[PDB]
Curated annotation (Swiss-Prot), chain D:
Record's GO cellular component terms: cytoplasm; cytosolic large ribosomal subunit
Protein name: Large ribosomal subunit protein bL34
Family statement drawn from the similarity comment of this UniProt entry: Belongs to the bacterial ribosomal protein bL34 family.
Keywords recorded for this protein, A-Z: Ribonucleoprotein, Ribosomal protein
Species for this entry: Escherichia coli (strain K12)
UniProtKB/Swiss-Prot annotation, chain E:
Function: Binds 23S rRNA. It is not essential for growth.
CDD domains (UniProt xref): Ribosomal_L29_HIP (cd00427)
Keyword presence, Oxidoreductase: no
Assembly mode: Part of the 50s ribosomal subunit. Contacts protein L23, trigger factor and protein nascent chains. Might also contact SecE and probably does contact SecG when the SecYEG translocation complex is docked with the ribosome.
Phenotype of null mutants: Cells missing both S17 and L29 grow very slowly and have a rather unstable temperature-sensitive phenotype.
Record Gene3D superfamilies: 6.10.140.1970
Full protein name: Large ribosomal subunit protein uL29
Disulphide connectivity of cysteines: none
GO BP terms: cytoplasmic translation; ribosomal large subunit assembly
An example Gene Ontology molecular-function term: rRNA binding
Family recorded in the similarity comment: Belongs to the universal ribosomal protein uL29 family.
Length: 89, 102, 77, 46, 63
RNA sequence: UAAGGUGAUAUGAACCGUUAUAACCGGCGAUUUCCGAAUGGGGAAACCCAGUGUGUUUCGACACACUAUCAUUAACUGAAUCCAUAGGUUAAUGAGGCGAACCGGGGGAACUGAAACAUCUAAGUACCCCGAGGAAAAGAAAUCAACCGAGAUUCCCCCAGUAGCGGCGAGCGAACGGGGAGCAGCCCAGAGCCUGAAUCAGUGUGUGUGUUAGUGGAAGCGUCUGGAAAGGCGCGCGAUACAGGGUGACAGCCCCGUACACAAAAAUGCACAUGCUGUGAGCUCGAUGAGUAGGGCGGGACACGUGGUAUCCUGUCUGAAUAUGGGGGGACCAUCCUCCAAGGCUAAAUACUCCUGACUGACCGAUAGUGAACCAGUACCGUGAGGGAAAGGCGAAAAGAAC
RNA sequence: AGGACCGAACCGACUAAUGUUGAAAAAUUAGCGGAUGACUUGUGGCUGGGGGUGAAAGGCCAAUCAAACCGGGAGAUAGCU
RNA sequence: CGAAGGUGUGCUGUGAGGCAUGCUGGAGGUAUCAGAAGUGCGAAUGCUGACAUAAGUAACGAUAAAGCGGGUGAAAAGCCCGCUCGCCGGAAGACCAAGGGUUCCUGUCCAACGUUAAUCGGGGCAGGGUGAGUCGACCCCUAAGGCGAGGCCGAAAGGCGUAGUCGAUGGGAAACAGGUUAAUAUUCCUGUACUUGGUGUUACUGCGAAGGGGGGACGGAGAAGGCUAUGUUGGCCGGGCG
RNA sequence: UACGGUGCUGAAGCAACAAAUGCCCUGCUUCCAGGAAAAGCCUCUAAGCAUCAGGUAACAUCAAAUCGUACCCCAAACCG
């Protein structure tokens, strides 16, 4: 079918920062940069398919891009999506 | 289609190095050629700490124009001009004033 | 619009000329009248917005031919 | 003093937005003029 | 890869090579964003690789 | 085609290549997210929400497709109402929107001039709207002419600032005729002698010339100044090539080219020979465009402002003869002359340039030339329609100044 | 009960002073009027230029009004500077 | 072995001008005789750029108000910390809507911006931060009103309008307390809950709409009663004994 | 102790009075100026269906998607 093509196309990167690492250590939660559309069902299916780990719930958000000044020009960065995936215990 | 190719030996016609011959190493898209060991510049290279950090005044070879070079012959011993001749299907270069293939 | 179904008369423009020749833009409207014609070939009344010269056209050549022309050009009735 | 511009994005998009200009014929001519001039912001939509 | 080895392949063998290229691209960009992958060019080539497969899949399955 | 490349600011890293499926260019294919005529419904554009159907299912769901309105046609149904329409449903085909100028039509100003102004002019101009094409419209004499004749329409130069029109003011202003560019004539209103007849559109085929990548393309060295030679000086060669650009100063002989000779697997536009689909062609017999021509009224166009104003067009009311007939020949009548209205189609000469290609300039050279040589219809101003800038130059080469 | 009374929020704008190249292209300060109504306010609609709307001043219609603003006739016209 | 340009000097013509030359510049200039002009500026409250003048003058934006110690630094009235002082407290406090758009937090820099300095910042640069079945939107439903198949009207554009379909400023299910980050929390975590659908079984049983009825579903003012939010005092508990 | 603050235990945790402009109260009285609509919700049946389908009731289960969530918000962040 075409489901596994979508599941491989959803995930982009794991996010890395202090809040991501602290949520991983305490709350058993991985933070992922996902696709822009990327619903919670597609994210949960993709993590359970491509990391072979069981997944409890997904909280997503859309991070807005910051207007950066380069020389004299102004460029708004990409709007991307972030997913806090809570695994099992 | 390029007369002066990469592993050639050419003699410089005009410049601070008129007459000095040498090997080509790099031709650029600009219509310029780096000839090995003629057009030397003293670049005041800055040391970069977040890399290997040499610094120092470095001799580089500057780009020379392709019209300033001409292919050395070592049959007549002077600069010659290069033409394009059609043998069996590959296009070859041929020397002028002696119709010989490079 | 004020358009006869048979003849196709539309309001044209023109001038109110006065006795001092002061022109004013005016309209010439057709003498349009919504009339019901009897049609033996359809055994019914067809309501057309016709002019009086349109009724003289229908009174000269019959309504079976004028409705054929309206069927021909693509208008409805 | 209360000034002449008191903003609201709903009245903005309902009066000067793209669908409002694309409704009427003169607004489509406004869009045609904005395209022929070559403007980068066609309407005020965002 | 090249065109002709894929041009001799079946439809469903092209499909499993498509899925293999998708898994390969997934692992590659995971290594790229993680801090691995000194050799970035693989990313680009695997991208064009998938396009090659998909092009033949639009010729072989029907057009 | 090719030994180099992975677009630019712009490096860098990691790589792909070199006798040929690296890159690059050209033809044809594939992909083509969402908005936009936006076409499934809606909407504050780039969003929200579906329906029906088919198949992939680990049963939580996915995927593909279709679903706008209008017009034409066909088929099912089907009201008051009996039949039948109206209406409802499905199918197939077309249209929709955008674009610089040109073209035709439906409307349509005023500033201004008249040294005020109202008729007039400006001006059928601007502007609005509708429609089509590569051109469009007009077009085959119910025309002009003058008792001699010319032979459809369009454009140019005269006639001619002439006759005329004109508060006879301001102004507007022909035609006849002549010289040219370009040439083309037909079909229906109907029957019988026939069915590929003189031919056009729609498909293939062959050839030629084009277009879309490209290939070959001649012949100069020494010496002095110089940062650097292409300059000066000296001695040679090419030239169907001394057009142009670049190369460290001014190059025919250093490079790219130019004159010249060539080059297409595939797509092609053009005109040539032929094969089908439809349509007839060639003869005699007849017909030969009715609410029409003309009239009364009110307007408009004709250069012609109602004047003695012919002619054309209509809003309104009327209303013939019909080839023993009818129109026109500038009031009108008679005689002659000339043509046949109320049905159509038609190429070239002509107008225009968003864009593409080459070339030119007693055109401009950064306050100029486009508003914009520069990431410009941008920053900025305005709710909005809309307005709208300034801003080029190191060097031959970054050798862009280590310490 | 009240287009009742006193008086905060709220709405207004009577007087004075300051400001007058302001802190502000209409304000501040101290007093002032209404403050259960013909009140006031948020949000969204509708009316558009010889037009709207006007408890009427030619007032207001985006700091513009005895006819807005933008673009076009248009380089209007100027016996005047 | 040095053009146009720029800048001095000296000759020369009745004048507009001309010629030579020193310095800078570093690549073009152009006789003579003809030809054409975007052909000569001091003025137009001329247009654009630059720079003066008033002049180191006014002013530095509420008369709520600061003082000191230590830090950090090259530099401290202004930043950080601490002690006092003063100002608001129906706000000059704490939440949101509208509207902005990253201004939020951390590290770092002081050219510009801040009417002064700045080590500071709502500034520059980089990194991080917005977690929802219950909150708001989306969604169901309508008001004013918009669009509007057909339709009716209109030179054309278009106007109005029925069926419909939008339109919140209104009506419609569901979550609280505590803890946590430098930055989120009714969203994360802990504890305890709630709502609406789809699917499966088990029983009883008539279900069914676009239609009928109820309900949703409503004004100003006034007065009293029951209460709570909240506050004050006592009791209790921990500390003090100045 | 990074000196900012993190880690563990943690007593009582009651009564009386006062009290709203908030809740009962979309109530009650009164007046004239006579005070939205529709759906969710409840109920009735018509066409239809009646082994079922559907409904009621209990239980198990799965789903609740998408968008906003920072910060200012009587203000140095909106309009001037």
């Amino acid at each position: 079918m075409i489901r596994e093509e979508r599941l491989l196309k959803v995930l982009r990167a794991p996010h890395v920062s202090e809040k991501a690492s602290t949520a991983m250590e305490k709350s058993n939660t991985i933070v992922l940069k996902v696709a822009k559309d990327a619903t919670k069902a597609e994210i949960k299916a993709a993590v359970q398919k491509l990391f072979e780990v069981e997944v409890e719930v997904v909280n997503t958000l859309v991070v807005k891009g910051k207007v950066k000044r380069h020389g004299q020009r102004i460029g708004r960065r990409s709007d991307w999506k972030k997913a806090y995936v809570t695994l099992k215990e | 289609a390029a007369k002066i190719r990469r592993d050639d030996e050419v003699i410089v016609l005009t410049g601070k190095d008129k007459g000095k011959r040498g090997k080509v190493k790099n031709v650029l898209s600009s219509g310029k050629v780096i000839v090995e060991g003629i057009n030397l510049v003293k670049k005041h290279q800055k040391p970069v700490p977040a890399l290997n950090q040499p610094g120092g005044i470095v001799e580089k070879e500057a780009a020379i124009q392709v019209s300033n070079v001409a292919i050395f012959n070592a049959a007549t011993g002077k600069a010659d001009r290069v033409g394009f001749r059609f043998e069996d299907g590959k296009k070859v270069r041929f020397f002028k004033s002696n119709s010989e293939t490079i | 619009s004020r358009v006869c179904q048979v003849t196709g008369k539309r309001p044209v423009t023109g001038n109110n000329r006065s006795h001092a020749l002061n022109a004013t833009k005016r309209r010439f409207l057709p003498n349009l009248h919504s009339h019901r014609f009897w049609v033996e070939s359809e055994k019914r009344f067809v309501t057309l917005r016709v002019s009086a010269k349109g009724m003289r056209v229908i009174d000269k050549k019959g309504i079976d031919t004028v409705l054929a022309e309206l069927r021909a050009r693509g208008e409805k009735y | 003093m209360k000034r002449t511009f008191q903003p609201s994005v709903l009245k903005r998009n309902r009066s000067h937005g793209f669908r409002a200009r694309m409704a009427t014929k003169n607004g489509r001519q406004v869009l045609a003029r904005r395209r022929a001039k070559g403007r980068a912001r066609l309407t005020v939509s965002k | 890869m090249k065109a002709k080895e894929l041009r001799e392949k079946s439809v469903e063998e092209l499909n499993t090579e498509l899925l293999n290229l998708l898994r390969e691209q997934f692992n590659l960009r995971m290594q790229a964003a993680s801090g691995q992958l000194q050799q970035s060019h693989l990313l680009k080539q695997v991208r064009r690789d998938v396009a090659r497969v998909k092009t033949l899949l639009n010729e072989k399955a029907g057009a």
